[PDB]
């Protein structure tokens, strides 16, 4: 997955849990879940974007 | 470019000319709409029904063929249709005419593709054209004839229903 | 971007279908203008129609006066229908389906003819003007251009 | 600027003299909201029943098929003298009629898909009159102006038979006023 | 020559079949394999040549098992169901082993067999080509004049009442 | 008749039930005199009653013991029109609604902002999708079996099991 | 006509106001010339 | 590519004509959503039981067995005189047939409609075999049609297809 | 009447299996609160956030069942 890619959530617990977001920024470092996903739905708290491991996201 | 007929019109664009008959006259422009060649099938097919219509008049007031009086009775022109309708005769000729229309079907189609002339059915068992001059006379004479007697008919038969005499007993009374 | 009753999908977020078929301008005597196979044009175009159209109304004619005739001995014909015409050999079933009852003229009551009509099923004209004129009658035919004249006199 | 047939408004938008029958006369704004296509090929059908109405409601006074259901000179009776099958008939017919002749695009949003369609070309020419090109926007002014007189002419006969009870030619022979 | 000279010439008709004077005006063999047609006329021609003989025969003949109708088109309602329905599966068993079982405009021909041609000549009578293409034009012929003919003794006979030969003299008219 | 009960148009207490709400009418119009708008109103009223009664006994209606008219919603044809006809109706209606409300649902998530295309309608599209639900029943089977109708389970959020 | 104006015009609660009043006349100018429909006639 | 049966519309992608009553007619597009080889066997069946159906409606008027003599002629009520004995045994031969149509259908690879049954070998040659399969499945359809007439035709009437055709009742 | 009465019950038996239902099959967890299992089958709530999260637990879906069973029995 890259910067700017549709990519579906696999996290159970997350609200987005199978809906797509968009990649927002991949970070280099060795951060747990670097993948910032940005998504149209927002979730029960209002926000809009979340960070995952590369195993939670897949490209559609 | 206007036309001979009507000198204050314009030609007509599907008249040309090369048909027996062109005048140039068609103010109303139906050449426009329809196919030339179907008009011309058509103005065949109505003029030489109506030269028989009206030769048939003229020769049914003149005479009856044996047995006709006896099922007839006194009655002329129309009037014999529905007689002969409730007789076998009308069924007999629509019968027979209608086969023969099924090949003239056939053969308006034909000329509508472009592979045969308006109202030419090949029908000259006796080779009098001969000439191709002699031809045209014929082909002018033809048309000429046909829509006098389209004319002639449509006189004769209201005629008939304003008097009930018939065209020949109509001229000898008023 | 949607335009009211523009009628393409794609501007209302329909699925499309993207094959769009160019028209052709073939024309057929009884069918319509659209896309049709190779070969098609030719073999049922406006010759086919209008000749199976011939046919048709030529084999109508013994179908509209479809019966059993039978001469007298007066040399007089007597109709009857083939409903009457029976069979010798299907069991139970004398009587058997005929070309009456594809074409049931007289469980209708209708006088069919070879021209479709008949002289018991006549198409019925009446003159509406009732044998009077279009202005100034006197009697009970009081036309508008009357009542216009009346209206204007008074 | 302004528009012909209504000289103190504007010209409307999307009318540009291109169809048949355009004066500039929309002051209700319908094709700056709807589309010119819709509009025209309902236009069309409208007019085309109209015609078809119009030319029924003065010939089934003169004429009549036989039978007792087929008597009546008034079309308003005839509507409901005429033997039922026959009309439910007829409503089947008229929905197979516009379901095929439309190729199964009969809605707002599928009819005009292709963009060899165009409005009230149903391709409906059985005797090829058409063919004529300097004829053509002539027969489509001619089409449109037929059917125009003909919703007129038929909406009013048939309030007229509402009003009188009667046949709209017999009607202008025996007329009564209210 | 052409049959009909104002129509143009039928293209899948060359000729070669015997009968060909250039008559589909409806134009027939445009649409249907001229193999099937060629078969179906043999046919229909065959068997009303067998029914005129038959007509003219019945007015006359009645084997002494049955009882004579009055007409031959009447002959065959006063025959046993049973005796008709053994006609019917024998011709049956004919036209399924003169075909090879192949009964259908799909696998009739699939061989590359020749119309009307089943295999039926026992008394030599097919030696001479000069002779064979004689009597082509000879069947057709008759078969086609016994089709129109068969059709108009029938429908006569069901109009008179009356058998051919028997209408043929004391003939009487519609009144 | 049907489950013990008779027609309404020969049930006396079908008349009894008539007869008493005309006499119940009948009082309050003695109070008025003719000619005033009450007594108009009051024998326009008389008029409804009775040519609903006869409507609802000449309709083949049957009526239980109580002397109202009882439904048969069993799927028999001699009672089609009391529950079956009236039902098709409603599906034909209901799901002219349910697809034009669907297809416009679809053409706003195609918006700049499709949630202002919920609050702020588009009338001219919007009104193009009512003209479109006509045909209700072929589009939705064919937007069903062309697979843009159901979504495969792996893409809807479900919650942890 | 004011584009803001059919804008607002179109929100939901006028647009929902103005399409139940619509339907709610149907139905009442139905049972006003057709009362008392229990049923479907047949 | 456009379907044959529709000129049209463009032809239905899960249909090819090497099924044997191909005409590309799938207007609804079932062949996109469900298993084609499915609705081939199903069609099958429904064709073949539709055969049997519209013959059956029909022979009784020619004729009955000696026991069913005095059975009535309408097919709706024919339906009811016969005892649930016979029914039972019918069933009973309909599942005893059935049960090689499940084995068939839910665990083997045949052509649709394949069951082992041709003894007198009529697909041995080749172009009758592909006629004979073009023409099951097109009087299959027919005798569908067939039989839906003659059942509504035989409860708006109550007498079986022949006898409302001679008596010509064909008014409600 | 008894036809009225039978799909009134029917109504309520159908809404109180529904509240019932969704209490037993949400008690692990939603999607307002996908780790319900570990606050266990009764607890008050989850706090405001998240747009508020009153009778969120199987309990509570316990706890507004017995009105409906208290209506269907009257
Ligand atoms: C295997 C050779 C064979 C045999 C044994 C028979 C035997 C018979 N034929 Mg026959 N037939 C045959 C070949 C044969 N046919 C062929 C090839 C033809 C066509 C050219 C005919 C044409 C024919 C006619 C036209 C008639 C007979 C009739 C009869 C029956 C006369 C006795 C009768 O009336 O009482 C029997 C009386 C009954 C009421 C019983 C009904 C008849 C049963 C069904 C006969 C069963 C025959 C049996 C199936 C063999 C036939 C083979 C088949 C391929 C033809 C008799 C049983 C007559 C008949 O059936 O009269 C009724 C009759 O009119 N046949
Ligand atoms: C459709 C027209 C028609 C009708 C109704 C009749 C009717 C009749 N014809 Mg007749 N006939 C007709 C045309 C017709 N014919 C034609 C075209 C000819 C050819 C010239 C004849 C030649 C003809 C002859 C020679 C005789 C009849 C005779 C008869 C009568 C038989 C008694 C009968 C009334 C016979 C009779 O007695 O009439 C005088 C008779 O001898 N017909
Ligand atoms: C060979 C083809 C043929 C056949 C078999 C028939 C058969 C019949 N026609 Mg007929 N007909 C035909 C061709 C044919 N027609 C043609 C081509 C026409 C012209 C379009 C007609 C016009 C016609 C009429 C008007 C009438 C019949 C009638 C009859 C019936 C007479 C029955 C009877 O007892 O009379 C037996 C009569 C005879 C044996 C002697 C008749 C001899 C006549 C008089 C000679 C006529 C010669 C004629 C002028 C030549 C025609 C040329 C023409 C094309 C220019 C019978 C069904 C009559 C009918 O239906 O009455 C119930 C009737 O009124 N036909
Ligand atoms: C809007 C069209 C319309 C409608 C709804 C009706 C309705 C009716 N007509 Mg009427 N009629 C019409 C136009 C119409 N008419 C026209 C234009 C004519 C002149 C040809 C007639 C002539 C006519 C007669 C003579 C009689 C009726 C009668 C009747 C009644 C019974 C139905 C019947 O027998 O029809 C008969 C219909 C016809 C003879 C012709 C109808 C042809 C129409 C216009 C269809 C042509 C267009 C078609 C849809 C093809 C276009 C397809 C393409 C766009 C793809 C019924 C109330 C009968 C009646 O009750 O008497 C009062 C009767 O006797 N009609
Ligand atoms: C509780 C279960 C139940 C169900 C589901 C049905 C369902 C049905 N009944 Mg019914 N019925 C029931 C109980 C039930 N009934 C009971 C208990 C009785 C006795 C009081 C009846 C007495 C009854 C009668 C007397 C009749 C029905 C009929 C029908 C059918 C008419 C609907 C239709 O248009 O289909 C038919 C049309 C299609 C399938 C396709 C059309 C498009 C329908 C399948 C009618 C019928 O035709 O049954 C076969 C009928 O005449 N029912
Ligand atoms: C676009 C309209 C639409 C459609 C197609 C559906 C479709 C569905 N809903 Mg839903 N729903 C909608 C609007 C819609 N809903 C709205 C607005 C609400 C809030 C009141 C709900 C509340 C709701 C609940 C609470 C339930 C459903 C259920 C269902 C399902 C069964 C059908 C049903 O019970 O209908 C009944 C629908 C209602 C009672 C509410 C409909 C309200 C109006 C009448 C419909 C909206 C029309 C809209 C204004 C059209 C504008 C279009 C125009 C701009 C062109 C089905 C998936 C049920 C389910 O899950 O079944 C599996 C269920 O329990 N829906
Ligand atoms: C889901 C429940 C339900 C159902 C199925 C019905 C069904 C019906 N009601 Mg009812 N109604 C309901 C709820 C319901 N209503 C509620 C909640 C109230 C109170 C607000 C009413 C108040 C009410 C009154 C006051 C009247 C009806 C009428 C009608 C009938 C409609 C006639 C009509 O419009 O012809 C449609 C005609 C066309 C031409 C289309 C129909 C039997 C009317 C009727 O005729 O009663 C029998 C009537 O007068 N209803
Ligand atoms: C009130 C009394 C009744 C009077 C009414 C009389 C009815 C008049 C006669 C019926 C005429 C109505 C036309 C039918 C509407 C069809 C419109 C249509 O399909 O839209 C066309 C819709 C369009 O659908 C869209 O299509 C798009 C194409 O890419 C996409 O797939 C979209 O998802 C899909 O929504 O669907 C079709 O394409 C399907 C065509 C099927 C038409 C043939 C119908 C077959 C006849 C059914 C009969 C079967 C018999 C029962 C079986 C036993
Ligand atoms: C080509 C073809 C063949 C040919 C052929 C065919 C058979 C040709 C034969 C043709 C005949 C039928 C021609 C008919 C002309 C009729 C006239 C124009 C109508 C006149 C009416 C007017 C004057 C009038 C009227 C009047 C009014 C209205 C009312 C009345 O009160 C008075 C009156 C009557 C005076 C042949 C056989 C040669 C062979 C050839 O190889 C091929
Ligand atoms: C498998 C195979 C073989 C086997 C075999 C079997 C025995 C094959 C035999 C099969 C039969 C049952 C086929 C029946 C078709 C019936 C339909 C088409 C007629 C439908 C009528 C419709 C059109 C109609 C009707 C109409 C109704 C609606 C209304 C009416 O007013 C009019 C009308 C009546 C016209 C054998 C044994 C050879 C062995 C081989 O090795 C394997
Ligand atoms: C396309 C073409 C086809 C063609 C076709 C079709 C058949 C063509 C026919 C078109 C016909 C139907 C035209 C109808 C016109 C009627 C309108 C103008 C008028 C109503 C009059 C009004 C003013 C009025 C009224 C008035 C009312 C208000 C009040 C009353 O007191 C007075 C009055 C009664 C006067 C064909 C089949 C040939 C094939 C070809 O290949 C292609």
Same mark, same amino acid.
């Given at each position: 997955?890259?910067?700017?890619?549709?990519?579906?959530?696999?996290?159970?617990?997350?609200?987005?849990?199978?809906?797509?977001?968009?990649?927002?920024?991949?970070?280099?470092?060795?951060?747990?879940?670097?993948?910032?996903?940005?998504?149209?739905?927002?979730?029960?708290?209002?926000?809009?974007?979340?960070?995952?491991?590369?195993?939670?996201?897949?490209?559609? | 470019?206007?036309?001979?007929?009507?000198?204050?019109?314009?030609?007509?664009?599907?008249?040309?000319?090369?048909?027996?008959?062109?005048?140039?006259?068609?103010?109303?422009?139906?050449?426009?709409?329809?196919?030339?060649?179907?008009?011309?099938?058509?103005?065949?097919?109505?003029?030489?029904?109506?030269?028989?219509?009206?030769?048939?008049?003229?020769?049914?007031?003149?005479?009856?063929?044996?047995?006709?009086?006896?099922?007839?009775?006194?009655?002329?022109?129309?009037?014999?249709?529905?007689?002969?309708?409730?007789?076998?005769?009308?069924?007999?000729?629509?019968?027979?005419?209608?086969?023969?229309?099924?090949?003239?079907?056939?053969?308006?189609?034909?000329?509508?593709?472009?592979?045969?002339?308006?109202?030419?059915?090949?029908?000259?068992?006796?080779?009098?054209?001969?000439?191709?001059?002699?031809?045209?006379?014929?082909?002018?004479?033809?048309?000429?004839?046909?829509?006098?007697?389209?004319?002639?008919?449509?006189?004769?038969?209201?005629?008939?229903?304003?008097?009930?005499?018939?065209?020949?007993?109509?001229?000898?009374?008023? | 971007?949607?335009?009211?009753?523009?009628?393409?999908?794609?501007?209302?977020?329909?699925?499309?279908?993207?094959?769009?078929?160019?028209?052709?301008?073939?024309?057929?005597?009884?069918?319509?203008?659209?896309?049709?196979?190779?070969?098609?044009?030719?073999?049922?175009?406006?010759?086919?129609?209008?000749?199976?159209?011939?046919?048709?109304?030529?084999?109508?004619?013994?179908?509209?006066?479809?019966?059993?005739?039978?001469?007298?001995?007066?040399?007089?014909?007597?109709?009857?229908?083939?409903?009457?015409?029976?069979?010798?050999?299907?069991?139970?079933?004398?009587?058997?389906?005929?070309?009456?009852?594809?074409?049931?003229?007289?469980?209708?009551?209708?006088?069919?003819?070879?021209?479709?009509?008949?002289?018991?099923?006549?198409?019925?004209?009446?003159?509406?003007?009732?044998?009077?004129?279009?202005?100034?009658?006197?009697?009970?035919?009081?036309?508008?251009?009357?009542?216009?004249?009346?209206?204007?006199?008074? | 600027?302004?528009?012909?047939?209504?000289?103190?408004?504007?010209?409307?938008?999307?009318?540009?003299?291109?169809?048949?029958?355009?004066?500039?006369?929309?002051?209700?704004?319908?094709?700056?909201?709807?589309?010119?296509?819709?509009?025209?090929?309902?236009?069309?059908?409208?007019?085309?029943?109209?015609?078809?109405?119009?030319?029924?409601?003065?010939?089934?006074?003169?004429?009549?098929?036989?039978?007792?259901?087929?008597?009546?000179?008034?079309?308003?009776?005839?509507?409901?003298?005429?033997?039922?099958?026959?009309?439910?008939?007829?409503?089947?017919?008229?929905?197979?009629?516009?379901?095929?002749?439309?190729?199964?695009?009969?809605?707002?949003?599928?009819?005009?898909?292709?963009?060899?369609?165009?409005?009230?070309?149903?391709?409906?020419?059985?005797?090829?009159?058409?063919?004529?090109?300097?004829?053509?926007?002539?027969?489509?002014?001619?089409?449109?102006?037929?059917?125009?007189?003909?919703?007129?002419?038929?909406?009013?006969?048939?309030?007229?038979?509402?009003?009188?009870?009667?046949?709209?030619?017999?009607?202008?022979?025996?007329?009564?006023?209210? | 020559?052409?049959?009909?000279?104002?129509?143009?010439?039928?293209?899948?008709?060359?000729?070669?079949?015997?009968?060909?004077?250039?008559?589909?005006?409806?134009?027939?063999?445009?649409?249907?394999?001229?193999?099937?047609?060629?078969?179906?006329?043999?046919?229909?021609?065959?068997?009303?040549? $067998?029914?005129?003989?038959? %007509?003219?025969?019945?007015?006359?003949?009645? @084997?002494?098992?049955? #009882?004579? +109708?009055?007409?031959?088109?009447?002959?065959?309602?006063?025959?046993?169901?049973?005796?008709?329905?053994?006609?019917?599966?024998?011709?049956?068993?004919?036209?399924?082993?003169?075909?090879?079982?192949?009964?259908?405009?799909?696998?009739?021909?699939?061989?590359?067999?020749?119309?009307?041609?089943?295999?039926?000549?026992?008394?030599?009578?097919?030696?001479?080509?000069?002779? $064979?293409?004689?009597?082509? %034009?000879?069947?057709?012929?008759?078969?086609? @004049?016994?089709?129109? #003919?068969? +059709?108009?003794?029938?429908?006569?006979?069901?109009?008179?009442?009356?058998?051919?030969?028997?209408?043929?003299?004391?003939?009487?008219?519609?009144? | 008749?049907?489950?013990?009960?008779?027609?309404?148009?020969?049930?006396?207490?079908?008349?009894?039930?008539?007869?008493?709400?005309?006499?119940?009418?009948?009082?309050?119009?003695?109070?008025?005199?003719?000619?005033?708008?009450?007594?108009?109103?009051?024998?326009?009223?008389?008029?409804?009653?009775?040519?609903?009664?006869?409507?609802?006994?000449?309709?083949?209606?049957?009526?239980?013991?109580?002397?109202?008219?009882?439904?048969?919603?069993?799927?028999?044809?001699?009672?089609?029109?009391?529950?079956?006809?009236?039902?098709?109706?409603?599906?034909?209606?209901?799901?002219?609604?349910?697809?034009?409300?669907?297809?416009?649902?679809?053409?706003?998530?195609?918006?700049?902002?499709?949630?202002?295309?919920?609050?702020?309608?588009?009338?001219?599209?919007?009104?193009?999708?009512?003209?479109?639900?006509?045909?209700?029943?072929?589009?939705?089977?064919?937007?069903?079996?062309?697979?843009?109708?159901?979504?495969?389970?792996?893409?809807?959020?479900?919650?942890?099991? | 006509?004011?584009?803001?104006?059919?804008?607002?015009?179109?929100?939901?609660?006028?647009?929902?106001?103005?399409?139940?009043?619509?339907?709610?006349?149907?139905?009442?100018?139905?049972?006003?010339?057709?009362?008392?429909?229990?049923?479907?006639?047949? | 590519?456009?379907?044959?049966?529709?000129?049209?519309?463009?032809?239905?992608?899960?249909?090819?004509?090497?099924?044997?009553?191909?005409?590309?007619?799938?207007?609804?597009?079932?062949?996109?959503?469900?298993?084609?080889?499915?609705?081939?066997?199903?069609?099958?069946?429904?064709?073949?039981?539709?055969?049997?159906?519209?013959?059956?409606?029909?022979?009784?008027?020619?004729?009955?067995?000696?026991?069913?003599?005095?059975?009535?002629?309408?097919?709706?009520?024919?339906?009811?005189?016969?005892?649930?004995?016979?029914?039972?045994?019918?069933?009973?031969?309909?599942?005893?047939?059935?049960?090689?149509?499940?084995?068939?259908?839910?665990?083997?690879?045949?052509?649709?409609?394949?069951?082992?049954?041709?003894?007198?070998?009529?697909?041995?040659?080749?172009?009758?075999?592909?006629?004979?399969?073009?023409?099951?499945?097109?009087?299959?359809?027919?005798?569908?049609?067939?039989?839906?007439?003659?059942?509504?035709?035989?409860?708006?009437?109550?007498?079986?297809?022949?006898?409302?055709?001679?008596?010509?009742?064909?008014?409600? | 009447?008894?036809?009225?009465?039978?799909?009134?019950?029917?109504?309520?038996?159908?809404?109180?299996?529904?509240?019932?239902?969704?209490?037993?099959?949400?008690?692990?967890?939603?999607?307002?609160?996908?780790?319900?299992?570990?606050?266990?089958?009764?607890?008050?709530?989850?706090?405001?956030?998240?747009?508020?999260?009153?009778?969120?637990?199987?309990?509570?879906?316990?706890?507004?069942?017995?009105?409906?069973?208290?209506?269907?029995?009257?």
């Amino acid at each position: 997955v890259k910067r700017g890619s549709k990519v579906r959530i696999l996290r159970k617990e997350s609200y987005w849990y199978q809906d797509i977001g968009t990649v927002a920024t991949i970070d280099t470092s060795g951060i747990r879940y670097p993948v910032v996903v940005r998504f149209e739905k927002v979730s029960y708290s209002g926000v809009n974007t979340n960070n995952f491991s590369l195993d939670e996201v897949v490209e559609v | 470019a206007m036309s001979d007929s009507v000198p204050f019109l314009k030609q007509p664009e599907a008249l040309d000319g090369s048909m027996a008959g062109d005048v140039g006259f068609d103010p109303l422009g139906f050449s426009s709409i329809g196919d030339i060649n179907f008009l011309r099938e058509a103005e065949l097919k109505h003029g030489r029904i109506a030269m028989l219509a009206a030769a048939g008049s003229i020769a049914q007031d003149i005479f009856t063929f044996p047995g006709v009086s006896k099922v007839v009775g006194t009655a002329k022109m129309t009037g014999v249709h529905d007689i002969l309708v409730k007789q076998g005769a009308m069924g007999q000729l629509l019968l027979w005419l209608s086969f023969l229309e099924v090949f003239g079907t056939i053969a308006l189609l034909e000329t509508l593709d472009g592979k045969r002339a308006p109202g030419d059915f090949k029908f000259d068992p006796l080779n009098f054209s001969k000439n191709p001059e002699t031809f045209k006379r014929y082909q002018l004479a033809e048309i000429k004839n046909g829509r006098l007697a389209m004319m002639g008919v449509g006189g004769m038969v209201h005629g008939y229903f304003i008097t009930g005499k018939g065209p020949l007993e109509l001229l000898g009374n008023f | 971007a949607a335009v009211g009753f523009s009628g393409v999908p794609s501007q209302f977020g329909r699925p499309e279908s993207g094959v769009y078929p160019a028209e052709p301008s073939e024309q057929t005597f009884l069918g319509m203008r659209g896309p049709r196979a190779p070969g098609h044009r030719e073999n049922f175009g406006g010759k086919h129609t209008a000749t199976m159209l011939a046919i048709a109304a030529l084999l109508w004619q013994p179908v509209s006066e479809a019966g059993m005739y039978r001469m007298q001995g007066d040399g007089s014909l007597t109709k009857t229908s083939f409903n009457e015409f029976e069979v010798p050999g299907f069991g139970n079933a004398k009587k058997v389906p005929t070309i009456e009852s594809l074409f049931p003229f007289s469980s209708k009551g209708f006088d069919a003819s070879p021209v479709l009509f008949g002289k018991n099923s006549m198409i019925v004209v009446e003159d509406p003007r009732d044998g009077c004129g279009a202005y100034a009658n006197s009697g009970s035919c009081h036309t508008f251009l009357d009542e216009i004249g009346d209206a204007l006199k008074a | 600027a302004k528009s012909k047939a209504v000289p103190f408004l504007s010209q409307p938008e999307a009318l540009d003299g291109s169809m048949a029958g355009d004066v500039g006369f929309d002051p209700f704004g319908f094709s700056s909201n709807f589309d010119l296509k819709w509009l025209r090929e309902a236009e069309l059908k409208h007019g085309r029943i109209c015609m078809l109405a119009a030319t029924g409601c003065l010939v089934q006074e003169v004429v009549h098929l036989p039978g007792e259901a087929f008597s009546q000179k008034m079309a308003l009776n005839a509507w409901a003298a005429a033997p039922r099958g026959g009309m439910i008939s007829i409503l089947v017919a008229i929905g197979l009629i516009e379901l095929i002749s439309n190729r199964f695009a009969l809605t707002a949003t599928d009819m005009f898909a292709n963009p060899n369609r165009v409005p009230g070309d149903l391709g409906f020419d059985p005797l090829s009159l058409g063919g004529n090109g300097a004829n053509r926007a002539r027969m489509e002014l001619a089409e449109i102006t037929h059917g125009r007189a003909a919703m007129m002419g038929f909406s009013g006969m048939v309030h007229q038979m509402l009003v009188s009870k009667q046949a709209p030619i017999e009607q202008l022979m025996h007329f009564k006023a209210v | 020559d052409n049959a009909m000279p104002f129509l143009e010439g039928p293209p899948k008709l060359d000729g070669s079949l015997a009968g060909d004077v250039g008559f589909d005006p409806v134009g027939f063999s445009n649409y249907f394999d001229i193999r099937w047609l060629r078969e179906a006329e043999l046919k229909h021609g065959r068997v009303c040549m $067998l029914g005129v003989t038959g %007509l003219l025969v019945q007015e006359a003949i009645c @084997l002494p098992q049955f #009882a004579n +109708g009055k007409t031959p088109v009447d002959d065959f309602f006063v025959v046993p169901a049973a005796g008709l329905w053994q006609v019917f599966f024998t011709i049956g068993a004919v036209e399924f082993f003169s075909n090879g079982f192949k009964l259908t405009p799909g696998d009739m021909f699939s061989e590359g067999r020749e119309a009307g041609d089943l295999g039926f000549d026992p008394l030599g009578c097919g030696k001479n080509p000069d002779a $064979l293409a004689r009597r082509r %034009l000879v069947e057709v012929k008759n078969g086609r @004049l016994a089709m129109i #003919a068969f +059709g108009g003794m029938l429908h006569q006979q069901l109009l008179t009442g009356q058998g051919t030969l028997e209408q043929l003299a004391n003939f009487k008219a519609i009144n | 008749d049907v489950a013990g009960l008779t027609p309404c148009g020969e049930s006396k207490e079908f008349a009894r039930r008539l007869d008493g709400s005309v006499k119940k009418l009948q009082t309050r119009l003695k109070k008025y005199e003719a000619g005033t708008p009450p007594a108009l109103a009051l024998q326009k009223q008389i008029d409804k009653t009775k040519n609903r009664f006869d409507r609802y006994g000449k309709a083949g209606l049957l009526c239980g013991t109580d002397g109202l008219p009882h439904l048969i919603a069993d799927g028999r044809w001699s009672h089609s029109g009391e529950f079956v006809i009236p039902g098709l109706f409603f599906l034909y209606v209901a799901g002219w609604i349910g697809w034009v409300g669907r297809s416009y649902v679809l053409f706003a998530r195609t918006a700049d902002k499709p949630t202002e295309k919920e609050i702020i309608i588009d009338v001219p599209v919007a009104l193009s999708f009512v003209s479109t639900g006509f045909i209700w029943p072929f589009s939705a089977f064919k937007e069903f079996t062309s697979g843009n109708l159901i979504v495969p389970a792996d893409e809807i959020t479900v919650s942890p099991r | 006509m004011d584009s803001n104006f059919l804008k607002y015009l179109s929100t939901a609660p006028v647009l929902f106001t103005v399409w139940l009043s619509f339907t709610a006349s149907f139905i009442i100018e139905a049972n006003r010339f057709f009362p008392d429909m229990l049923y479907f006639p047949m | 590519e456009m379907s044959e049966a529709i000129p049209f519309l463009p032809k239905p992608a899960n249909i090819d004509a090497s099924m044997p009553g191909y005409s590309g007619f799938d207007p609804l597009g079932f062949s996109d959503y469900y298993n084609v080889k499915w609705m081939q066997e199903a069609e099958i069946k429904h064709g073949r039981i539709c055969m049997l159906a519209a013959l059956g409606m029909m022979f009784p008027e020619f004729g009955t067995l000696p026991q069913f003599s005095s059975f009535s002629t309408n097919p709706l009520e024919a339906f009811y005189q016969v005892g649930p004995a016979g029914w039972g045994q019918i069933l009973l031969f309909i599942g005893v047939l059935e049960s090689f149509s499940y084995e068939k259908v839910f665990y083997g690879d045949s052509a649709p409609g394949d069951l082992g049954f041709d003894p007198l070998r009529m697909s041995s040659n080749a172009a009758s075999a592909k006629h004979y399969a073009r023409a099951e499945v097109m009087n299959g359809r027919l005798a569908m049609i067939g039989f839906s007439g003659m059942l509504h035709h035989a409860i708006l009437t109550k007498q079986g297809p022949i006898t409302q055709i001679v008596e010509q009742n064909f008014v409600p | 009447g008894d036809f009225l009465i039978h799909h009134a019950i029917a109504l309520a038996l159908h809404t109180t299996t529904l509240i019932l239902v969704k209490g037993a099959l949400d008690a692990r967890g939603s999607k307002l609160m996908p780790d319900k299992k570990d606050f266990g089958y009764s607890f008050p709530c989850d706090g405001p956030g998240r747009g508020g999260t009153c009778d969120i637990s199987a309990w509570d879906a316990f706890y507004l069942s017995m009105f409906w069973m208290l209506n269907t029995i009257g």
